[PDB]
Design a protein around this ligand. Structure first.
Ligand SMILES: Brc1cnc(Nc2cccc(CN3CCOCC3)c2)nc1NCCc1cnc[nH]1
Length: 301
């Protein structure tokens, strides 16, 4: 029965470069979580300084459609990042299995995605690698984007990459690719090999099928521009007609984090029952430490 801290490990769900992701169950609350495991003996002191800077950024991202950090466990040899588990898997695999989303469903998911990316851009964080593997779905079909703020070597894509491949314009291109997959069920640029795929991206031409509206085609043009300076801004794309159809009283606007309630006495009483003292509870919550206590508090809610 392998444990990591207060977590029971169940199975691997992702791997790449220097990272591995496992599904686990929190022993104290029974809640499923995803645990990214990074072997620090696999890194140079430059890479470790990088990892720490990027963990710090992860701690400032608090958005309902961004995979949330619950707890950090660090030993001499390993860094464990305990984060939200998205039981639905990749959006891309859901589209392959079930075909395009109709524009209503696609609009609802794309509003979540634009909100998450704009919220990060507002904090001067660019993803740089939005792709199939990090657009995930939770049990209620809400989007959860993984790996914001993380360099590639700590994560587990030619079809999504802007032609000029570090600023937000790079994400805006990817968002256009993503939008096209949601409404069509297919990628806008493909090829028989990577050389042909690259050539199609640089040509910038993609097919508008019979079922896609003018308003949807017009929206795509704000993202999928070869010149990065002529790409729309996310604060600008937020006012687009397609984006807000059926949201006439509810225009998409930059997300504002809620105030964190760290004073829920029911959850604090539960955690005293678990064996934590009132004083370590109060300190961990007030300092927002991403430790075994703050994780339990969040998982209790
Ligand atoms: Br962080 C993180 C948080 N949530 C997820 N959920 C996830 C990913 C892939 C598949 C599934 C669902 N299947 C079926 C049920 O049995 C579990 C596996 C859920 N993945 C996270 N990272 C890994 C990202 C990833 C992308 N392609 C593979 N892995």
């Amino acid at each position: 029965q392998p444990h990591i801290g207060n977590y029971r490990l169940l199975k691997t769900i992702g791997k790449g470069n220097f990272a591995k992701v496992k599904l686990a169950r929190h022993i104290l609350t029974g809640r499923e979580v995803a645990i990214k495991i990074i072997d620090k003996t696999q890194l140079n002191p430059t890479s470790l300084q990088k990892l720490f800077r990027e963990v710090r950024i992860m701690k400032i991202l608090n958005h309902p459609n961004i995979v949330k950090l619950f707890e950090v466990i660090e030993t001499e040899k390993t860094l464990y990042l305990i984060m939200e588990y998205a039981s639905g898997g990749e959006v891309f695999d859901y589209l392959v299995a079930h075909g395009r989303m109709k524009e209503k469903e696609a609009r609802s998911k794309f509003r979540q995605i634009v909100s998450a990316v704009q919220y990060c851009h507002q904090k001067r964080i660019v993803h740089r690698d939005l792709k199939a593997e990090n657009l995930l779905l939770d049990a209620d079909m809400n989007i959860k984007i993984a790996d914001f703020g993380f360099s590639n070597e700590f994560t587990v894509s030619p079809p999504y990459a802007a032609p000029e491949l570090d600023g937000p314009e790079v994400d805006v291109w990817s968002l256009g690719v993503i939008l096209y997959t949601l409404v069509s069920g297919s990628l806008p640029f493909d090829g028989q090999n990577l050389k042909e795929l690259r050539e199609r991206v640089l040509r910038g031409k993609y097919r508008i099928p019979f079922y896609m509206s003018t308003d949807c085609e017009n929206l795509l043009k704000r993202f999928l521009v070869l010149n990065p300076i002529k790409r729309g801004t996310l604060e600008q794309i937020m006012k687009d007609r397609w984006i807000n159809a059926g949201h006439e009283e509810d225009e998409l606007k930059p997300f504002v984090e809620p105030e964190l309630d760290i004073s829920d006495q029911k959850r604090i009483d539960i955690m005293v029952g678990m064996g934590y003292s009132q004083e370590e509870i109060q300190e961990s919550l007030s300092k927002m430490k991403y430790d075994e206590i703050t994780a339990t508090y969040l998982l209790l809610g």
